[PDB]
């Protein structure tokens, strides 16, 4: 269909650009002006530039004029957008989409419907590291409580994400994956997955299987009581 293949999720420390192939498909080019829009996670969206496909009219947005360069590749209808002197503000999922060209022969669109799927770019100076999981998965008998919960402490990993499963994904009840809240310390985001077992489960160990594939690290854990 009228589709966009974005490629690909990539981070840079403060360095050079993350020029994204925005591969168009299904619809004809040189009639449909393609934009770019950034959105930081948990934030609103920011349109940041839109070329006309042929006779490339740049229309870069405010605060980056400048740092952005957008190019066209109408041999095979991909488009591109760079950034210059990258910076920690550029922790945003970059979406390309199509305004529609505001020429004379181009058909009427205003509404961005090829939609691109998104591209993870966080600008980041951290190094690729596995998590340092500091769990507690006790035998639900801490002091006296019946449905005593447990959870691991997925700490100090980079980049995203970790993949955590309780006992190779056996314990799915009570699973509440805390998102990657990002450390201001070393840009090593923090997550945790917890479950709520009962006190009549004390002869059961629970292994969060924390598997951080961008560092190719795999973590299995358990914690018991203290006599």
């Amino acid at each position: 269909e009228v589709q966009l293949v974005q490629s690909g999720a990539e981070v840079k420390k403060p360095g050079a650009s993350v020029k994204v192939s925005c591969k168009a498909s299904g619809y004809t080019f040189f009639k449909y002006g393609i934009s770019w829009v950034r959105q930081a996670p948990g934030q609103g969206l920011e349109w940041m530039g839109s070329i006309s496909p042929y006779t490339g009219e740049t229309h870069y947005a405010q605060k980056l004029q400048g740092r952005v360069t957008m190019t066209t590749d109408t041999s095979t209808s991909t488009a591109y957008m760079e950034l210059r002197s990258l910076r920690s503000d550029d922790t945003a999922v970059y979406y390309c989409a199509r305004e529609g060209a505001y020429g004379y022969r181009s058909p009427y669109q205003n509404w961005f419907d090829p939609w691109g799927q998104g591209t993870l770019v966080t600008v980041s100076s951290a190094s690729t590291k596995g998590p340092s999981v500091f769990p507690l998965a006790p035998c639900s008998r801490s002091t006296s409580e019946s449905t005593a919960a447990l959870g691991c402490l997925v700490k100090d990993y980079f980049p995203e994400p970790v993949t955590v499963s309780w006992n190779s994904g056996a314990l799915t009840s009570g699973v509440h994956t805390f998102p990657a809240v990002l450390q201001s310390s070393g840009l090593y985001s923090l997550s945790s997955v917890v479950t709520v077992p009962s006190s009549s489960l004390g002869t059961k160990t629970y292994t969060c299987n924390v598997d951080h594939k961008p560092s190719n690290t795999k973590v299995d854990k358990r914690v018991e009581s203290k006599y």
């Binding site: 040189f30 042929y54 066209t72 590749d73 041999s75």
Partner: peptide
């Protein structure tokens, strides 16, 4: 010029 797409034009 080819990635300007003279062919399609």
């Amino acid at each position: 010029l080819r990635k300007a797409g003279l062919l399609e034009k």
